[PDB]
Amino acid sequence: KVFGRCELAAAMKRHGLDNYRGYSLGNWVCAAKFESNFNTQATNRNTDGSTDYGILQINSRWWCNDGRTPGSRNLCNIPCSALLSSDITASVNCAKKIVSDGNGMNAWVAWRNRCKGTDVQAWIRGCRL
Ligand SMILES: [Cl-]
């Protein structure tokens, strides 16, 4: 499913991401726009052989199992296919583990390069939250 901007902001707020580890809701909406264009079914393969899955492009070397990433760790305890669901619960629960890992939202390259330090409140402007 391809979310609208405000529909996803509302879904993230309901699942407890607003201000999670100090990151306001606009940071999570901005990271989803540039990682996946708000599409839960987005996949992209990396040069190391790992693949990124879903709305927040969570990687199979560390976080989920896809059966084709040798020596990888499955820290979230989920098949990577669960991250492609229309229901974002598994992606949000695993994103909370990633953002707590020490480097905060700098784990998301698109957030560091396109959201960090910008007016991220713009991403939630106009929405009924
Ligand atoms: Cl980037």
Q: What does the CA dihedral 96, 30, 84, 80 come to, rounded to 10 degrees?
A: -50
The 3-state secondary structure of 48-60 reads: CCCEEECCCCEEC
Two tokens, residue 54: 């879903």
Q: What does the CA dihedral 109, 20, 102, 120 come to, rounded to 10 degrees?
A: 30
Indicate if 35 belongs to the active site: yes
User: What protein residues have CB closer than 5 angstroms to ion ligand 1?
Assistant: 109-110, 113
Catalytic residue among 35, 66, 87, 119: 35
Q: Which amino acid is at 63?
A: W
For residue 110, list its beta bridge partners.
none
* Composition of the chain by helix, strand, coil, percent to 5: 40, 10, 50
Distance CA 78, CA 91 (A): 10
- If DSSP codes are grouped into helix, strand and coil, which group holds residue 75? coil
Indicate if 52 belongs to the active site: yes
The strand ranges marked E within the chain are 43-45, 51-53, 58-59
Sequence-ordered list of residues with C-beta below 8 angstroms from that of 81, at least 6 positions apart, any chain? 53, 66
Question: Class for domain 1-129, per CATH?
Answer: mainly alpha
| Residues 51/41, Cβ–Cβ less than 8 Å | no
For residue 79, list its beta bridge partners.
65
Distance from CA of residue 80 to its chain's centroid? 13
CA 112 to centroid of ligand 1, rounded, Å: 7
| Residues 123/33, Cβ–Cβ less than 8 Å | yes
- Experimental determination approach used: X-ray
| Residues 83/58, Cβ–Cβ less than 8 Å | yes
Sequence-ordered list of residues with C-beta below 8 angstroms from that of 61, at least 6 positions apart, any chain? 48, 50, 69, 72, 73
DSSP-H helix ranges across 15-100? 25-36, 89-99
| Residues 10/127, Cβ–Cβ less than 8 Å | yes
Please, is 8 exposed, middle or buried when counting C-beta atoms within 10 Å of its C-beta (0-12, 13-18, 19+)?
buried
Backbone angles phi, psi at 79, to 5 degrees: -65, 145
Distance CA 46, CA 102 (A): 23
- In the annotated binding site, the residues are 101
Distance CA 52, CA 60 (A): 6
